[PDB]
């Protein structure tokens, strides 16, 4: 193998040889990849169009140097609530607020995150406003999940030799392949999630991805450009479950949600979106929370397919019945609460 | 004008807006772009297609930026015998020996040329091995071209800032854009050439930037490989005349050529092919003189075409008649050891 072989082969607009994208990704993981090599890898994928078997090897490889979490830390059950971000939108932290949500109601969640890469605040951003530790690491995080019910994993704390392409994803800036991985590479490997993606025509390499790992996963695109469930139009759903991938086009409407519009999910600096998660968390009514239940709905509908007897539209309503009484009893609001004061008391 | 816009745009393959390419290229040739920047610009470029507009304006910003020679030195009607390189076959220096012969004719020639890339000795290698002078600068090369009737500008002796972009063009291995550059940037700006190219799905588009220009330029496609035209099989030339192109097949046997096989045109290290340079030179019969013959009566039916009442079978005719009076007469020969003094007495 090698780079001239394997930029050759996309460039020729071939898919790659079965270990060849491995062999890529882990050469780039290990320091030993030229910034151009890296960037010409990046770029000739893209745009060659990525299968899910390629992407599903450079997610293994990091996966395979990323630090895992303790032996037996991690529920069977876990979910991540997290997307590729890159919408170009300024919302509110969507998956950061459902991913509460859903540990209030009782699923286990591990959130793979990071800051931002162009929006204004990321998911990491605005819980280090909020006043939760992102920067612990397996050991602690273990902790978490087990104290409080909520983990989170900090993307360079547990992928640090990802640095490389981190500073050629910068660079070219240009969203490619690698803006696929954050989703794809959470180090807990939780079984279920919620995982948005920006790009549309990239969702179902993802849920591919998915697929082959056997996850219950909603991959899910907004018909606006949201990597999230939105409520100012129709989602587009890639539904992972038994191996298998099929595209549904989702309607909160049919559910009972007003419409809204993209300005009313509109966000600021971590400070701002800190206050919208307190406010959200503090019962406070309209577009954000509706939009919060609704992403936190699919994170328990993902979590319910773990199992055969899974079915749809009572998933749904189960999973909209969960997350507005996590919100309405309280528990998400004094889950966060509860998720502070640990980081505090080390 | 930014990274993310072009590069943008590149990816989702989309042609570049007019001026977009001359800013990257610029970028590039000021070093104000990372090793990351200039990879990726090279590969989306390759992948989305280049127009001959794209092509034209890297070679432009290259030409821009290049050491000019002086006001007046260069002839109207100077030619350039000259390829891509990147073949991947091993020859004798085709382009190089029929440009000793060419001059010997009496058409000028200004030869721009580089070391090899990956072959075993390029046409500077070669021109080394002979004991010419490769690196002279703007005014010695036009005092070459002006006492010898020759003159070869070495790309890195002209194209200083070009130095990023090459150091990428290596470490990515793979062809791209970058490679068609060398033929569209001869620093002495001739108005005619043989112009060989390697990547058949890519001369098209350096016939396009050539017929912008109004070069007569005639650009060469073995139909085995070859950079060149090859005496093995038919030539696919596109022929720029009048600010227009013409795509035709050439076959060799039209003219009396006995078909050779690919291992009679094998080269060697600098030594192996300075010597095959000397025995062509010196009235040795065979292939490789055949070749050459062939090669040289091309770039004597580009000098041709620069009158708008040449024809394509008559100037066949004259440009083999010449080609072979150069090398019987000992003219061709005359002009290396005369060449190889005027590098040596200043
Ligand atoms: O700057 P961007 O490239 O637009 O990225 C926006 C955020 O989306 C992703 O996270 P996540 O889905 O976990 O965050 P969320 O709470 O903002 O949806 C990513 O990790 C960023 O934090
Ligand atoms: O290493 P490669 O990428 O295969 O390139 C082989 C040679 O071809 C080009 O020159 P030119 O056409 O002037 O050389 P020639 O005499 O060998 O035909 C290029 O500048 C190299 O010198
Ligand atoms: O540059 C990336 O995509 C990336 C790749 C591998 C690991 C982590 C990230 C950061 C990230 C985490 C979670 C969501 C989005 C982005
Ligand atoms: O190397 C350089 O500094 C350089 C600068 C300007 C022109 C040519 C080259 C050499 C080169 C060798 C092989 C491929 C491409 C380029
Ligand atoms: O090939 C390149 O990267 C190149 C680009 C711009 C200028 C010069 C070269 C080197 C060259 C000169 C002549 C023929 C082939 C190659
Ligand atoms: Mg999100
Ligand atoms: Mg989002
Ligand atoms: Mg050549
Ligand atoms: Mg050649």
Redesign the pocket.
Known sequence: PSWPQILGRLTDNRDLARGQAAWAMDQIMTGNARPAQIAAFAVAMTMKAPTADEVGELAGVMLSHAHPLPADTVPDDAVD????????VN?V?????AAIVVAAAGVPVV?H???????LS???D?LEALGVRIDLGPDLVARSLAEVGIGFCFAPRFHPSYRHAAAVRREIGVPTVFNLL?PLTNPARPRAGLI?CAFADLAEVMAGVFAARRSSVLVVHGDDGL??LTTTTTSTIWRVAAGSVDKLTFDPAGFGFARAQLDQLAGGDAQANAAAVRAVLGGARGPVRDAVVLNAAGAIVAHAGLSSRAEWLPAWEEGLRRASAAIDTGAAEQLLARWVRFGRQI
Chains 1, 2 share one sequence.
């Open positions: 609530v997290v997307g590729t971000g890159g919408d170009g919302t932290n969507l998956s950061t607020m959130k995150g990071n800051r931002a890469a162009s929006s990321g998911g990491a605005t954050g948005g990597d999230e």
